[PDB]
Design an enzyme around this catalytic site. Structure first.
Site, mmCIF file in Angstrom:
data_model
loop_
_atom_site.group_PDB
_atom_site.id
_atom_site.type_symbol
_atom_site.label_atom_id
_atom_site.label_comp_id
_atom_site.label_asym_id
_atom_site.label_seq_id
_atom_site.Cartn_x
_atom_site.Cartn_y
_atom_site.Cartn_z
ATOM 1 N N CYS B 105 18.953 102.732 40.009
ATOM 2 C CA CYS B 105 18.459 103.225 38.793
ATOM 3 C C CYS B 105 19.264 104.718 38.581
ATOM 4 C CB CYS B 105 17.046 103.386 38.508
ATOM 5 S SG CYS B 105 16.836 103.556 36.571
ATOM 6 N N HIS B 125 21.537 102.990 36.330
ATOM 7 C CA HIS B 125 21.011 102.653 35.020
ATOM 8 C C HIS B 125 22.109 102.986 33.881
ATOM 9 C CE1 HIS B 125 18.646 103.173 31.418
ATOM 10 N NE2 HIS B 125 17.771 102.423 31.936
#
EC number: 3.1.2.-
Lengths: 188, 188
Positions: B105, B125
């Protein structure tokens, strides 16, 4: 105007099934209370993750009512839920005021123990099917998420995101669920 | 003969991205240490879940080496990772002994901060892409899980299961990963 969720956290709960709904529900703007069955003290989950609850269930009970009561799974966690008289009272009160009850994996078996929602369509983890169905009091579904009336159930750790988003959709609506879902990078 | 994993847990970490790999890795028989960046004290994650670490990073550093070092995401968590000199040392040592480094992420941005793995293919991400790519030191991928050499990266909370199983597959092999996966009730 804020919806409220109670998550009941017992020793031996599946920590993934606890954290994913809490996190997602809080992304949706729901006020979540993680309530420890035994008190305010830290709880050792099934895979030894240790979580600090927001409050004891005794204190959280007095700050009701909740728009959803959430029962995570884990075999030993569900057994502690099924044996607790406080859970029975909370669940019975929630059923009477027609509030949502959500349980995942082994968690639905607490419902049977507490004579909650007989007649409803439910799902469980496959390994918990026989226990949930003792007596034929529910109808079994193999859907990953199942919602019958005010009873929302789901199957396992891997369905935790879909379970949580179904809670969001029921409390706050489909557009909020879609808005909270997009940044998570789910496949479907 | 037991593989060992270090998970570095900082204030503001994404709690789902922390608990899912820990739980899955422990299902695979890996010895996981959840190490708190700031000490042994409880850590408030991004969505206010509070987790108790197994040890301080200071103590866990002395019990090395680890077969995988795991960096969760969360924007403030990754920033705390990126600023920590202890993380830099741990990561640099892990890179030198050719051990696995796994980040999800926003977590991969700590790698850039610490000059770790330049030249590798990585994902993040989507909202962290610009930051990871400042300088052109990596090549970007939009795969949900990306593995280039000893650098394993993934994109968001919703890819956490695939990320964790990729760690299992790299440490313990494809059959253990398949065995741990089946009871989780994942879709694919």
């Amino acid at each position: 105007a804020s919806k409220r969720a109670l998550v009941i956290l017992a020793k031996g709960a599946e920590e993934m099934e606890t954290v994913i709904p809490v996190d997602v529900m809080r992304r949706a703007g729901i006020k979540v209370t993680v309530a420890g069955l035994a008190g305010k003290d830290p709880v050792q989950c099934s895979r030894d993750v240790v979580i600090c609850p927001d409050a004891s269930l005794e204190d959280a009970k007095k700050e009701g009512p909740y728009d959803v009561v959430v029962l995570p799974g884990g075999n030993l966690g569900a057994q502690n839920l099924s044996e607790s008289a406080a859970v029975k009272e909370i669940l019975k009160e929630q059923e009477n005021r027609k509030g949502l009850i959500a349980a995942i994996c082994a968690g639905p078996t607490a419902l049977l123990a507490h004579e909650i929602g007989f007649g409803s369509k439910v799902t469980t983890h496959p390994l918990a099917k026989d226990k949930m169905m003792n007596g034929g009091h529910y109808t079994y579904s193999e859907n990953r998420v199942e919602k019958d009336g005010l009873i929302l159930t789901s199957r396992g750790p891997g369905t935790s995101f879909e379970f949580a988003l179904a809670i969001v959709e029921a409390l706050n609506g489909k557009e909020v669920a879609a808005q909270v879902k997009a940044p998570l990078v789910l496949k479907d």
